[PDB]
Write a protein that binds this ligand. Structure first.
Ligand SMILES: [Mg+2]
Ligand SMILES: [Mg+2]
Ligand SMILES: [Mg+2]
Ligand SMILES: [Mg+2]
Ligand SMILES: [Mg+2]
Ligand SMILES: [Mg+2]
Ligand SMILES: [Mg+2]
Ligand SMILES: [Mg+2]
Ligand SMILES: [Mg+2]
Ligand SMILES: [Mg+2]
Ligand SMILES: [Mg+2]
Ligand SMILES: [Zn+2]
Lengths: 94, 37, 50, 120, 148, 177, 49, 101, 86, 94
RNA sequence: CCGAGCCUGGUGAUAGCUGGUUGUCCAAGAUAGAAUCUUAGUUCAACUUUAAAUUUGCCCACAGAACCCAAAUCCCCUUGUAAAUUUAACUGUUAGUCCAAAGAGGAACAGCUCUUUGGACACUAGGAAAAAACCUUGUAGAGAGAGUAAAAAAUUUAACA
């Protein structure tokens, strides 16, 4: 006795969830810190025209750095030392 | 299901929390307006 | 009804939080809510809702 | 259906009571936002999560600095609900080259240029 | 696995820390081969490092047999009589050095689960809790509902 | 400390005989305190493996009182095991037939549902009246207080309290009472 | 360590509980009057820099 | 992580200290110190000059092999690995207090 | 616990965040010698240094952009002066 | 020696008698034993606390299964604190 | 053991169908559709993968995008960021479930069916009772350290001159 049809949380009839002062407090907290965010997002410092073309140089140079990092691609160098170090497996005392 | 239904369509839990937060809190004085005034 | 929605002590209102999308509730909600703030749910009507 | 949520500009118009409450002077406004991610970028749309990732807030509870300009304001207005904001406050002026190492943040948005690590 | 493997309480041998500390690694015994590519690291180790190791640690004694071995071994005998064997087969000189050093630093007793990371012979001061610590007494020591 | 090992261990893990008078108290609160004191949670040396429980005694279980209409609304239900053996009895008839059953069932529900529940319930002791056998009113320690304080009746309110309490209104003389 | 002291050093734990209770009473006095009063003696805090 | 210690007692640390065996060490951070009849609480920690906690290092030892397996059913997801973290064993030699207070 | 109180007082919500309980050295030689820094404190100092450097860079870029705007506007004024002079 | 307590290393008999002799030598009254607290006197696990009081002055108190074990253990405690071998004593310096 | 015998051989018949598919460790990775005697499949596309060449790629700011009879979208220099396009080579997925929203069908029935925008699942973890799809939360270890996230339903009801 006391069951509900089908799955518990979906369909035309489901288990009725209810709210608690716990969750209400939590979400009022979220939205009041969101209102503080609204306030601090207001009152900007500069305008579009003031902030238009100041960081273009930095963006450009960073992008050329990325370009150089991508272009600088080769196999690594090969060395006679790395080749002949393998002979040292048959080392033995006289 | 559909939006418009004969029955009251059970809503999302966040929506129900929102509706539980938003109500008409009537402005009441600290003193009842009959006994004192 | 209008003096109630003017005198409500609750600082938070459906219309405010929905127009602002303060918690991503635009997911759960409809576009119609933005006019049918709280009073309506499908066809029904909650006059006590504000 | 669910799409981008355009916000009216009237929301971003601080009132006098909001000014005297939050302590933010509109004249001589702050320059830098300390931003911190609170909620999970999961269960959120792809544009929200990629905005978070481009701002550099993939890591939670790690304050990250941005400017106060409209081009950034747009992004963190799209992702308000995932973050908390504060302005940057410093009494000791910008950190000089000698005090690059002895810097420290505070929960109050303050950034102290010198950190003696010893009480009064 | 903990329930499969045995356990022990944390403890030091013969109370080594209080008085003069002693390097509790008594003896080492290397078994290396003249030939064998596996023993090349061990051979270079006994060539160059082991001298410095002995100069640094006099309390320990080292033996080297230098006989044919397909796998070079290192044995460590401790004060308790604990034997600790390791195979240095195909091992680098730096890794051999780290192994020998961690053996010198290790104590002569098994590595198994430790129930608790501490050990206090005198754990209690002010007297440990008993039921009658934090409750008062009665006039003439009278039980509840007692006339005389 | 300066106590020997075995005696100190004994004194630490010893059992204690608590006593309670259930004269007009709620079986719920009584059972909560009894359950914690039977687990041994009140002992800072508690661990489920170490049976640090304590013996507890209740008296005047007959003269207990619910909060609300529990006496008739509450139902204790049990199935004998046979068809039609589903029996339901109000707290009223259940108390009239056995005044201890209410408190013991409340404590049995309060306790954890492990195999130590039965042992702790055995260590528990209950008495309908203020009468106790010699041994188990002798080997006691102390009586912990009650959960609720009972209010006074007009039979108990002394005269000076009534005089201190001010009269609130003046009746008209022309009225019957 | 709180539990360890509750077991093996009950007197120190009683001292700590007494301190906590005194701080509660100071906080209650503050709830009555927030400012306009001398701050509590133990409620006072140490600031580092 | 916190501990409560006395003299002639051992302590285990689940990391390396870079201190050879047998060396001594002065521990600074103390949240309190207590005797039979009194204690000294910090705000948060005590003064340097008041206390002096000295310990000796006795052993560096590799932990027993701790196994880490991840398995998921009906997905052919199985992966094991073994970890051995170092430990440093210390013994608290002496605890003393200064008259300054 | 007490995170809100610590924040109201200005301290970290989690005491492990910053302060003398974590930033100070955990051990030193009995001879009185200073111990080597721990990796945690080292990386914290490094990231704080990068943080301050970034703050300085951002502020300098903002100031330079504002000054460039002001210069462009006063040049606009000067060139209108030139226009009506011609 | 630091690990083992003293009565583990030094066996004795009639500790109460040795205590009485010591106190007589120290010129104080012969103390009397009195159970301070008790629990489960009737059940199989009796517990008693016996304190030794001289001239209405307590030197030591000890727990015990029975009154005899409690009083002998209390005499042991008194001997410990008299001879200065309490577990809470100054450890051996170096 | 005859809708047409048994044996051998072709024959390792063929099977878009079912089952099965052997040591360890790491990383990236579920994704629009068209055609098909085609819908239990395959080919192309899309997504995904590897190595290389190059530079623009993503969010986007004013302006800009129809007469007929809404939420948003396209384009987009800035800005914050670091990805993107192309070249060489295959594979696999191409039988999809729930929630919210705009709708169509049906009974304004379905855990129903069909398109679109988004999220989750098909990957670990905490809660809601156990629970796929709901709410918090992601990048991986040891701790006998700590601060937090979502997280527990409230209701009692009718006198009358
Ligand atoms: Mg079901
Ligand atoms: Mg629908
Ligand atoms: Mg046939
Ligand atoms: Mg991977
Ligand atoms: Mg066609
Ligand atoms: Mg097919
Ligand atoms: Mg563009
Ligand atoms: Mg369906
Ligand atoms: Mg379906
Ligand atoms: Mg599949
Ligand atoms: Mg992590
Ligand atoms: Zn009134």
């Amino acid at each position: 006795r006391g069951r509900i049809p089908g799955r518990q949380w979906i369909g035309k009839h489901r288990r009725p969830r209810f709210v608690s002062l716990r969750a209400k407090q939590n979400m009022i907290r979220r939205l009041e810190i969101e209102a503080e965010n609204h306030y601090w997002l207001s009152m900007p410092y500069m305008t579009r025209e003031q902030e238009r073309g100041h960081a273009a140089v930095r963006r450009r140079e960073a992008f050329e750095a990325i370009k150089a990092a991508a272009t600088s691609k080769f196999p690594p160098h090969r060395f006679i030392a790395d080749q002949l170090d393998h002979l040292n497996v048959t080392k033995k005392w006289s | 299901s559909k939006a418009v239904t004969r029955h009251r369509r059970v809503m999302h839990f966040q929506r129900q929390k929102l509706m539980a937060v938003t109500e008409y809190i009537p402005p009441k004085p600290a003193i009842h307006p009959s006994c004192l005034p | 009804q209008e003096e109630r929605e003017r005198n409500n002590q609750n600082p938070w209102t459906f219309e405010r939080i929905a127009t602002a999308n303060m918690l991503g509730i635009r997911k759960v909600l409809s576009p119609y809510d933005l006019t049918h703030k709280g009073k309506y749910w499908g066809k029904f009507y909650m006059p006590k809702r504000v | 259906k669910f799409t981008r949520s355009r916000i009216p500009e009237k929301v971003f118009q601080a009132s006098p009571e909001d000014h005297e409450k939050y302590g933010g002077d509109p004249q001589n406004p702050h320059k830098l936002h300390i931003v911190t991610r609170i909620k999970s970028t999961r269960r959120r749309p792809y544009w929200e999560k990629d905005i978070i990732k481009m701002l550099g807030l993939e890591k939670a509870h790690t304050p990250q600095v941005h400017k106060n300009i409209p081009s950034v304001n747009a992004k963190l207005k799209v992702v308000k609900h995932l973050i908390r904001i504060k302005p940057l406050k410093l009494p000791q002026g910008l950190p000089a080259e000698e005090n690059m190492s002895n810097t420290c943040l505070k929960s109050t948005g303050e950034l102290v240029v010198q950190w003696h690590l010893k009480p009064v | 696995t903990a329930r499969g493997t045995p356990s022990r309480f944390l403890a030091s041998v013969l109370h080594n820390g209080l008085g003069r500390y002693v390097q509790q690694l008594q003896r080492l015994s290397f078994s290396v081969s003249r030939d064998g590519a596996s023993s090349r690291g061990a051979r270079e180790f006994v060539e160059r490092e082991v001298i410095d190791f002995a100069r640094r640690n006099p309390g320990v004694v080292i033996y080297v047999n230098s006989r044919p071995c397909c796998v070079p071994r290192v044995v460590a005998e401790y004060l308790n009589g604990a034997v600790r064997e390791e195979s240095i087969h195909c091992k680098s000189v730096e890794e051999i050095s780290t192994l020998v050093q961690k053996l010198a630093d290790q104590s002569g007793l098994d590595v198994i689960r430790i129930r608790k990371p501490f050990h206090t012979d005198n754990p209690s001061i002010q007297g440990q809790w008993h039921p009658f610590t934090n409750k008062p007494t009665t006039f003439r020591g009278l039980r509840p509902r007692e006339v005389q | 400390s300066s106590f020997s090992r075995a005696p100190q261990q004994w004194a630490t893990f010893a059992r204690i005989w608590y006593l309670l008078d259930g004269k007009m108290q709620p079986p719920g609160k009584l059972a909560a305190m009894a359950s914690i004191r039977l687990q041994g949670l009140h002992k800072p040396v508690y661990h489920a493996l170490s049976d640090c429980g304590d013996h507890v005694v209740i008296m005047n279980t007959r003269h207990i009182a619910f909060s609300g209409n529990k006496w008739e609304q509450k139902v204790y239900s049990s199935h004998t095991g046979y068809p039609g053996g589903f029996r339901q009895v109000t707290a009223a008839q259940l108390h009239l037939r056995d005044p201890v059953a209410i408190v013991k069932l409340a404590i049995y529900g309060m306790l954890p549902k492990n195999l130590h529940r039965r042992t702790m319930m055995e260590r528990l002791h209950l008495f309908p009246d203020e009468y106790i056998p010699e041994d188990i009113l002798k080997n006691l320690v102390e009586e912990l207080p009650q959960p609720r304080k009972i209010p006074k009746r007009l039979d108990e309110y002394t005269q000076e309290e009534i005089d201190a309490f001010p009269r609130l209104w003046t009746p008209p003389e022309d009225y019957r009472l | 360590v709180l539990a360890d002291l509750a077991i093996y050093e009950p007197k120190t734990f009683k001292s700590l509980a007494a301190l906590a209770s005194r701080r509660r009473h100071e906080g209650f006095a503050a709830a009555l009057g927030d400012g306009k009063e001398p701050e509590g003696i133990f409620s006072r805090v140490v600031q580092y820099h | 992580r916190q501990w409560k210690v006395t003299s002639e007692d051992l302590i285990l640390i689940g990391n390396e200290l870079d201190l050879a065996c047998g060396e001594r060490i002065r521990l600074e951070k103390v949240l309190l110190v207590g005797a039979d009849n009194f204690t000294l609480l910090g705000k948060p920690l005590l003064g340097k000059d008041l206390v002096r906690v000295e310990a000796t290092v006795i052993e560096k030892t590799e932990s027993w092999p701790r196994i880490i397996m991840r398995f998921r059913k009906r997905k052919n997801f199985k992966k094991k690995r073994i970890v051995t973290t170092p430990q440093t064993v210390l013994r608290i030699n002496s605890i003393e207090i200064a008259p300054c207070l | 616990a007490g995170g809100q109180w610590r924040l109201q007082q200005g301290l970290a919500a989690n005491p492990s965040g910053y302060g003398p309980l974590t930033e100070l050295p955990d051990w030193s030689y009995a001879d009185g010698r200073p111990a080597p820094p721990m990796k945690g404190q080292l990386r914290r100092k490094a990231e704080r240094e990068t943080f301050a450097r970034r703050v300085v860079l951002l502020s300098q870029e903002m100031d330079a952009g504002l000054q460039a705007w002001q210069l462009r506007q006063q040049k606009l004024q000067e060139e209108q002066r030139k226009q009506e002079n011609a | 020696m630091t690990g083992k307590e003293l009565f583990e290393m030094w066996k004795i008999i009639n500790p109460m008698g040795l205590l009485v002799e010591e106190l007589k030598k120290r010129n104080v009254s012969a103390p009397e034993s009195r159970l301070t607290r008790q629990s489960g006197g009737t059940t199989a696990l009796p517990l008693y606390f016996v304190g030794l009081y001289c001239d209405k002055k307590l030197i030591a108190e000890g727990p015990g299964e029975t009154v005899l074990v409690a009083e002998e253990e209390a005499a042991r405690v008194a001997l410990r604190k008299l001879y200065g071998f309490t577990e809470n004593r100054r450890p051996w310096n170096y």
